[PDB]
Structure 1
Amino acid sequence: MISLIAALAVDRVIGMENAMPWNLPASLAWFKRNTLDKPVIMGRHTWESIGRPLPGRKNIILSSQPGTDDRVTWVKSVDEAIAACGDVPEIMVIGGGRVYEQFLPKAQKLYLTHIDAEVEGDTHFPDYEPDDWESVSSEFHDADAQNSHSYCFEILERR
């Protein structure tokens, strides 16, 4: 089963190349809890933003360019990315924009962090029609001394 996991600001803006303007450790912990022990597929920009292989996860990079690093798996296509994950119960797609566009058709679950921040951006998370998706769980949290903005975790299942 293929799942997409993303953090969206107002209007579905998502990061593209530069780091996003927020500091949300509670949300990164949620990202960790939900991707640990599973394979993660991401594009080149995400991988440069992360800065190293996420531990406890099989790191798969989907890019047209070559593999700088040997601690992860470099693949040139969707089928190849899918294949490198082997047979597992759940494959996590962690972005960015293009990658999400490529897997959305095949996705069965969406884990999203909705963040109350207005950010000017080019890239948007794909339009997903919530009538094609059932929201199953939602949990809001206010900003605090450690989290810059209010955020809401949402899980949706494809119907």
Structure 2
Amino acid sequence: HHHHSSGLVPRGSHMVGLIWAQATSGVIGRGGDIPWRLPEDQAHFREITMGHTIVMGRRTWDSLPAKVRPLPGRRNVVLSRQADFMASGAEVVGSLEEALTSPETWVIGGGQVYALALPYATRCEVTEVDIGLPREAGDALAPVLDETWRGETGEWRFSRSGLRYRLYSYHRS
């Protein structure tokens, strides 16, 4: 069965969304990359963010596959404290306040930027990957979401590869 979910979330004059994929342990990144491959999550990330402003930390920009840098179809905003940073086809901003000026914004990583943006977020789109990768020194980590967050939990699904995952759609006022 499909998680008979409404999939509806009202919005106000500002919508700040966070979107990430995490292992059970909260690991989201390692060695400059994501330590699994999940086609359905790539498709999910693309469909949620298409047509919107996306905000990412400089290390997440570095981690994009060079052929989809900038991510097409989205206004790419890179957060860096390097005034001279070269992000061809994107814009570089020096502060989170300026990065979140678009009326709709999806924060797409990484660990540092999720943490700083979480107080302003009203949606979290989380892919939980059922992989038992323990946290290691240097890992990038997903935020811990408290009980101000509410929403819907999807059913477990298998990718054709056999990797198991599920989608959480969280929101708050």
Q: TM-score, normalised by structure 1?
A: 0.88
Higher helix content, 1 or 2: 1
CA distance in structure 1 between the partners assigned to 2:153 and 2:25 by the alignment = 20
In the alignment, is residue 110 of structure 1 matched against residue 124 of structure 2? yes
Contact 1:139 / 1:154 at 8 angstroms: preserved in 2? Answer: no
Question: How many pairs are equivalent?
Answer: 152
SS in 1 for 2:154: strand
What is the aligned partner in structure 1 of residue 148 from structure 2? 132
Q: Which amino acid aligns with 1:60?
A: V
- Structure 2 unaligned residues grouped into runs of 5+: 1-14
Match of 2:159 among 132, 143, 157: 143
Identical aligned residues as a percent = 36
Deviation sequence 1:10-40 (CA, Å, 0-9, x none): 2211115422232211110000000000000
CA distance in structure 2 between the partners assigned to 1:69 and 1:21 by the alignment = 24
SS in 2 for 1:14: strand
CA distance in structure 2 between the partners assigned to 1:17 and 1:59 by the alignment = 23
Contact 2:29 / 2:35 at 8 angstroms: preserved in 1? Answer: no
What is the aligned partner in structure 2 of residue 63 from structure 1? 80
Deviation sequence 1:74-118 (CA, Å, 0-9, x none): 0110112123x3xx3x21000101100111000000000000112
- Structure 1 unaligned residues grouped into runs of 5+: none
| 1:142 CA displacement | 1.2
Contact 2:16 / 2:123 at 8 angstroms: preserved in 1? Answer: yes
In the alignment, is residue 98 of structure 1 matched against residue 112 of structure 2? yes
Match of 2:70 among 46, 50, 53: 53
Match of 1:79 among 97, 101, 105: 97
SS in 1 for 2:54: strand
Q: TM-score, normalised by structure 2?
A: 0.81
Contact 2:40 / 2:159 at 8 angstroms: preserved in 1? Answer: no
What is the aligned partner in structure 2 of residue 38 from structure 1? 52
Contact 1:136 / 1:157 at 8 angstroms: preserved in 2? Answer: no
What is the aligned partner in structure 2 of residue 24 from structure 1? 38
Structure 1 stretch displaced more, 63-72 or 30-39: 63-72
